[PDB]
Design a binder for this molecule. Sequence first.
Ligand SMILES: O[C@@H]1[C@@H](O)[C@H](O)OC[C@H]1O
Ligand SMILES: O[C@@H]1[C@@H](O)[C@H](O)OC[C@H]1O
Ligand SMILES: O[C@@H]1[C@@H](O)[C@H](O)OC[C@H]1O
Ligand SMILES: O[C@@H]1[C@@H](O)[C@H](O)OC[C@H]1O
Ligand SMILES: [Ca+2]
Ligand SMILES: [Ca+2]
Ligand SMILES: [Ca+2]
Ligand SMILES: [Ca+2]
Ligand SMILES: [Zn+2]
Length: 316
Amino acid sequence: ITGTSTVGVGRGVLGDQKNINTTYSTYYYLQDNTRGNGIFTYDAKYRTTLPGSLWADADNQFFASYDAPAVDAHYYAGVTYDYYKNVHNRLSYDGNNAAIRSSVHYSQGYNNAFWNGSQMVYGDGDGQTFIPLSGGIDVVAHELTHAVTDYTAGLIYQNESGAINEAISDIFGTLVEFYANKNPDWEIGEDVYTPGISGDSLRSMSDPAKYGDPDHYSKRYTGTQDNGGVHINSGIINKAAYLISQGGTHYGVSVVGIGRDKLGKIFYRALTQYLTPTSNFSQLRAAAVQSATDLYGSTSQEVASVKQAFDAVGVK
Ligand SMILES: O[C@@H]1[C@@H](O)[C@H](O)OC[C@H]1O
Ligand SMILES: O[C@@H]1[C@@H](O)[C@H](O)OC[C@H]1O
Ligand SMILES: O[C@@H]1[C@@H](O)[C@H](O)OC[C@H]1O
Ligand SMILES: O[C@@H]1[C@@H](O)[C@H](O)OC[C@H]1O
Ligand SMILES: [Ca+2]
Ligand SMILES: [Ca+2]
Ligand SMILES: [Ca+2]
Ligand SMILES: [Ca+2]
Ligand SMILES: [Zn+2]
């Protein structure tokens, strides 16, 4: 909508207060004009018609329980935009400041979030498996990274290319979480997963096997569930990325960590320069090696650590 840019305040899913960029035109809309061509947050009103209604508020104060998922989807979309612009010089998910749109209150008791090819969508959870999923910055960044992937490598969402697609979203979801620097970890979804169970998460990058996901290529799932296990075999790549950044000895193979920033530069370059829709795990290794070579040289520790990490998870 056309209006004047202003700043509101509210509370997110976890009860934390934050300011949000809004637009005033009779009502205050969750429309942030300070980033690219706008960040727009919508209310699906417990239905599945998308995008729903652009979120309208009468007084620019968003402290109602019903407001919280919108606050966080809107705010964390902005953080993720900032990450890609400030860290990778990428303007929104298409590189040309495409508008970022998010809908919350999707359906009833919906225990998931997703990028639908045009926008992000967040369920409220059922209060047992999940609370509203936009409360997790790694979830928000995970989904928006799917958009980045769709506009760059275009990894098909099945089998190994789909598992890479998932891992990329977990990797940059985590790197955005570290970028914002509020309780950062190498776990996925911990902030919105199982409110009645402490210390758990949906996936682990540091130890995928914690939740039954493979941490080595020999353990990859080869059935048909989950589009060929795209959320399962992602653990193999998540572990490799974790090792590149943090180091460790995995199945007896030692990896010297090079830190989160260099992990991001290597995998972002791989994603945007070398990966293709049909890339498999072995092609990802080559892409990451070439990216590290571009950035730091063929004889660098960085290239060495990329090789060790993929060796450690059995990807040749
Ligand atoms: O879980 C939902 C909650 O996030 C919202 O605030 O009010 C409706 C609930 O279904
Ligand atoms: O209570 C909710 C209210 O906060 C919102 O503004 O409109 C929908 C209602 O369910
Ligand atoms: O607020 C209620 C919400 O919790 C549920 O998801 O659908 C019915 C609504 O009235
Ligand atoms: O999937 C397994 C899980 O069920 C168990 O609790 O801990 C080990 C995991 O491999
Ligand atoms: Ca209000
Ligand atoms: Ca965390
Ligand atoms: Ca996390
Ligand atoms: Ca939990
Ligand atoms: Zn995903």
